[PDB]
Design a protein around this motif. Sequence first.
Motif, PDB file in Angstrom:
ATOM      1  N   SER A 121       0.694  -1.540   0.458  1.00 22.96           N
ATOM      2  CA  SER A 121      -0.106  -0.263   0.401  1.00 22.96           C
ATOM      3  C   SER A 121       0.925   0.869  -0.060  1.00 22.96           C
ATOM      4  O   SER A 121       1.853   0.895   0.284  1.00 22.96           O
ATOM      5  CB  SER A 121      -0.737  -0.049   1.309  1.00 22.96           C
ATOM      6  N   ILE A 122       0.289   2.397  -0.627  1.00 18.18           N
ATOM      7  CA  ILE A 122       1.286   3.962  -0.779  1.00 18.18           C
ATOM      8  C   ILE A 122       0.215   4.700  -0.733  1.00 18.18           C
ATOM      9  O   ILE A 122      -0.906   5.227  -0.792  1.00 18.18           O
ATOM     10  CB  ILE A 122       1.728   3.511  -2.623  1.00 18.18           C
ATOM     11  N   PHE A 123       0.659   5.579  -0.131  1.00 19.79           N
ATOM     12  CA  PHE A 123      -0.126   6.569   1.172  1.00 19.79           C
ATOM     13  C   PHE A 123       1.056   8.050   0.508  1.00 19.79           C
ATOM     14  O   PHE A 123       2.429   8.057   0.864  1.00 19.79           O
ATOM     15  CB  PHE A 123      -0.014   6.548   2.227  1.00 19.79           C
ATOM     16  N   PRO A 124      -0.010   8.709  -0.306  1.00 20.99           N
ATOM     17  CA  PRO A 124       1.130  10.032  -0.043  1.00 20.99           C
ATOM     18  C   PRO A 124       0.500  11.058   1.192  1.00 20.99           C
ATOM     19  O   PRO A 124       0.026  10.641   1.718  1.00 20.99           O
ATOM     20  CB  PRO A 124       0.177  10.702  -1.350  1.00 20.99           C
ATOM     21  N   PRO A 125       1.276  12.342   1.142  1.00 16.57           N
ATOM     22  CA  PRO A 125       1.540  13.285   2.165  1.00 16.57           C
ATOM     23  C   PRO A 125      -0.168  13.552   2.366  1.00 16.57           C
ATOM     24  O   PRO A 125      -0.489  13.797   1.329  1.00 16.57           O
ATOM     25  CB  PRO A 125       2.369  13.836   2.149  1.00 16.57           C
ATOM     26  N   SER A 126       0.317  13.767   4.016  1.00 17.63           N
ATOM     27  CA  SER A 126      -1.444  14.112   3.928  1.00 17.63           C
ATOM     28  C   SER A 126      -1.440  15.884   4.133  1.00 17.63           C
ATOM     29  O   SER A 126      -0.059  16.482   3.564  1.00 17.63           O
ATOM     30  CB  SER A 126      -1.947  14.015   5.589  1.00 17.63           C
ATOM     31  N   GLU A 128      -1.983  17.659   6.220  1.00 15.63           N
ATOM     32  CA  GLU A 128      -1.382  18.323   7.616  1.00 15.63           C
ATOM     33  C   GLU A 128      -0.259  18.470   7.195  1.00 15.63           C
ATOM     34  O   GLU A 128       0.343  19.451   7.698  1.00 15.63           O
ATOM     35  CB  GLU A 128      -1.954  17.366   8.607  1.00 15.63           C
ATOM     36  N   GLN A 129      -0.116  17.832   6.991  1.00 16.02           N
ATOM     37  CA  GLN A 129       1.662  17.374   6.353  1.00 16.02           C
ATOM     38  C   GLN A 129       1.883  18.291   6.494  1.00 16.02           C
ATOM     39  O   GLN A 129       2.917  19.277   6.178  1.00 16.02           O
ATOM     40  CB  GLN A 129       2.884  15.991   5.954  1.00 16.02           C
ATOM     41  N   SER A 132       2.584  21.823   7.186  1.00 14.61           N
ATOM     42  CA  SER A 132       3.286  22.003   7.861  1.00 14.61           C
ATOM     43  C   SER A 132       5.067  21.448   7.072  1.00 14.61           C
ATOM     44  O   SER A 132       6.031  22.464   7.799  1.00 14.61           O
ATOM     45  CB  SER A 132       3.527  20.675   9.303  1.00 14.61           C
ATOM     46  N   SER A 136       5.765  13.043   3.688  1.00  9.65           N
ATOM     47  CA  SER A 136       6.382  11.847   3.603  1.00  9.65           C
ATOM     48  C   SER A 136       5.430  11.211   3.190  1.00  9.65           C
ATOM     49  O   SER A 136       4.826  11.162   3.012  1.00  9.65           O
ATOM     50  CB  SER A 136       6.026  11.352   5.089  1.00  9.65           C
ATOM     51  N   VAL A 138       4.132   7.106   2.605  1.00  5.08           N
ATOM     52  CA  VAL A 138       5.029   5.759   3.245  1.00  5.08           C
ATOM     53  C   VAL A 138       4.438   4.741   2.290  1.00  5.08           C
ATOM     54  O   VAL A 138       3.279   4.747   1.558  1.00  5.08           O
ATOM     55  CB  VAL A 138       3.798   6.093   4.255  1.00  5.08           C
ATOM     56  N   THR A 183       9.313   4.774   3.992  1.00  7.68           N
ATOM     57  CA  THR A 183       9.218   5.852   4.489  1.00  7.68           C
ATOM     58  C   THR A 183       9.758   6.578   2.630  1.00  7.68           C
ATOM     59  O   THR A 183      11.240   6.989   4.278  1.00  7.68           O
ATOM     60  CB  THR A 183       8.834   6.554   6.210  1.00  7.68           C
ATOM     61  N   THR A 185      11.044  10.670   2.665  1.00  6.72           N
ATOM     62  CA  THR A 185      10.791  12.291   3.918  1.00  6.72           C
ATOM     63  C   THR A 185      11.035  13.105   2.154  1.00  6.72           C
ATOM     64  O   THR A 185      12.654  13.024   2.045  1.00  6.72           O
ATOM     65  CB  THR A 185      11.726  11.854   4.777  1.00  6.72           C
TER      66      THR A 185
END
Lengths: 216, 209
Positions: A121-126, A128-129, A132, A136, A138, A183, A185
């Motif tokens: 599974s791949i996840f784009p940055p939120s 929220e992140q 900030s 990252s 993941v 991850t 970064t």
Amino acid sequence: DIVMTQAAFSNPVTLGTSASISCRSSKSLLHSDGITYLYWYLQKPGQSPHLLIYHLSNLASGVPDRFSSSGSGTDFTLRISRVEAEDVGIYYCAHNVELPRTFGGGTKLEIKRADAAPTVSIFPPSSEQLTSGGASVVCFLNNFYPKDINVKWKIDGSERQNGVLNSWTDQDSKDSTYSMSSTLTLTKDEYERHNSYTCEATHKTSTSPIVKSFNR
Amino acid sequence: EVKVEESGGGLVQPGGSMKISCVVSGLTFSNYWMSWVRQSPEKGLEWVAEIRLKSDNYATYYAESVKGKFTISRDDSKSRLYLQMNNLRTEDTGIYYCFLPMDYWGQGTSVTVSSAKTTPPSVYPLAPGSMVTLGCLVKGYFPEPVTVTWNSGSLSSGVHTFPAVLQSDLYTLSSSVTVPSSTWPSETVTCNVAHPASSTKVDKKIVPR
Ligand SMILES: [Pd+2]
């Protein structure tokens, strides 16, 4: 100090078969009173140690009779007759004949099971992140067997190694698999300079990697 | 049955001090010997101090590596054991357990000796861009540990939290949860992160992007 010597690892043991774990002590633990003051503790992953066997061959309350232990004053053997997933962990031997109290280094029981491909599974940055200033990405490579595995990140088709950090779980107490996170970064600044993000898992269960991607 | 529960851990500067304790229930505390055993990847399990009973004039024993630095004590009326640790060094970093020889272990309390500062984690949801996998990224904290749960502990199966990785004296970890597809987003999934050293408790609902 008494030195308790045990190997770090066991050859993987097929589910439902026999495991054997050795310990030795630099001093005899056989006391004039008949008792050999050898103890075994199990530390399951993420848990504290718990008592398994006391006085060499006595099972603690609740311990399954698949467990058994034998030995002299100086050389000892823990046997699990038909290993189950739940038995994975680190097995420690200890004496109780003097101070200081000392432990063996622990022997990790590995279970052997059927090869299993990872679920990737791949996840784009939120959002929220990104607020900030971070980005990252993941990738989870979950519930595979055996432990060995490779992950490759690509940004817009080109291989990226910079900013990659990997972490592997201990063997699972339930299904005897392993999982790994990778991850990537980035700063928001660098993340927004590219569009397509890919993680590729290569594992013995196929000659082709499992590829997951997204477009920013 | 018997419950052994430690507290008082956290972060302190090299040369500083710390006092940890545990409370035991489910046995008559005053009748048991008491010890502390620490665990580090570098040294494994290491017995450091033991205290005997009121009848033994509360006799005490220490590992050579901590004699002079550590003081073990007990308050039988409160069912509580203490360890006073002075002039700490980076190598005193570890998980400290109460161990009642030979039968009982507590759950450990973490003591970090470092000159780096405590930093709370930032927590970010991992949502996708028959089963569905979700996660939480816990980034930029110091010291270890953090604990992650999912729906306040309700989701336990299909969960794993990956070991933290250290970079530039900050830790990052992630946790993944796998649930059935229909269930999320229809039912809520939330990761709950605690960082005792900064007294942070955060909840992050995972919403579809
Ligand atoms: Pd020695």
